[PDB]
Amino acid sequence: HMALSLANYLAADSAAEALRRDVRAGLTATQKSLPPKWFYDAVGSDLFDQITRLPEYYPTRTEAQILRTRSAEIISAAGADTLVELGSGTSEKTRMLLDAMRDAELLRRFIPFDVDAGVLRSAGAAIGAEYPGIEIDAVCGDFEEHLGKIPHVGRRLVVFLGSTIGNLTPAPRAEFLSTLADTLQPGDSLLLGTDLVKDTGRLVRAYDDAAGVTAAFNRNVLAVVNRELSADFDLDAFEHVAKWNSDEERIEMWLRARTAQHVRVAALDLEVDFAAGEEMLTEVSCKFRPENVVAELAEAGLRQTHWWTDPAGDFGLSLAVR
Ligand SMILES: O=C(O)[C@H](Cc1c[nH+]c[nH]1)[NH+]1CCCC1
């Protein structure tokens, strides 16, 4: 029910000023861009939830199938009594892990780490009900800034799933992994999900689905800006574009102006122009090679002790330690 400990390191005024900075810089750049963190307002989070069920979007259910068939092994390997989730704690995946920990009579604690306090409270209620006696310590924070705020209590399995790590470009990605590694004690383990290089047709379709749901998700970032900063983006005037970048081996999401657009962002006293056909970068989703996952982990000071992958080789999960 209501039993909970919650620490909150996020302030609304801080979030608001960050959006102002990001939007000003991103829209005044010669190559325009917007950071994908701003996708996830209430509407956008709901749209992403739907993306996880699209037939083209294999990542979620591929990862889920790996956990479904190997959760006992994962939990045995970790030997952890505390599950730290860098993410919501809402999904079936969380419960696969928690169930496996309970089955092994190891489970003592759940530490959800997410940017939305409301979601954390909901997760706390649900998990508290399903696993009576469990200690729940929630942390409201940004996983690029507040990893140091995660409690060091217990033997901890830190999980970072869904190929979230792929939404970070190499430099911030390496900084994140190194920082996370520095918070791990002997006994702690990292469970990392990484989407893998594969047929490029399948990759693009996964980010450009027939139903146009991803397109709606992408364009919604314009609605966020419109609402929060009093802008006048015409969402209809922008086309969703998903590209495979073979040099960097990553999917890229873009918004392309159908015709010349003049956008006023009132809250920034800012005007910007899009030429007909001008494209704005809104997200990258890096795809990994198995051998390189080992290397990126090692660079962060982490040793990969276990590697699970589906039989098609579509997706990978790593267990790593200090
Ligand atoms: O890169 C991805 O696959 C998605 C974001 C996304 C999904 N469809 C379009 N973008 N990430 C969101 C957090 C986990 C992965």
Explain what this protein looks like in three dimensions.
With 322 residues, this protein is of the alpha/beta class. It folds into 2 domains: 188 residues, Vaccinia Virus protein VP39 (Rossmann fold), CATH 3.40.50; 134 residues, no CATH class. The protein contains 9 helices and 13 strands. The protein has an 8-stranded mixed sheet, with helices on both faces. A 3-stranded antiparallel sheet has the order 7-8-11, covered by helices on one side. The protein has a two-stranded antiparallel sheet with strand order 9-10. Helix 2 packs antiparallel against helix 8 and helix 3 packs parallel to helix 4. Bound molecules: Pyrrolidinohistidine. The site of Pyrrolidinohistidine (AVO) has 11 residues, from strand 11.
Spatial gap, N to C terminus: 36 Å
Global outline = globular
Small-molecule binders here are:
Pyrrolidinohistidine
How many independent structural domains? Answer: 2
Instruction: Using the coordinates above, name the CATH class of the largest domain.
Output: Alpha Beta
Structural class: alpha/beta
Offer a concise description of the structure.
The chain is α/β, with parallel strands linked by helices.
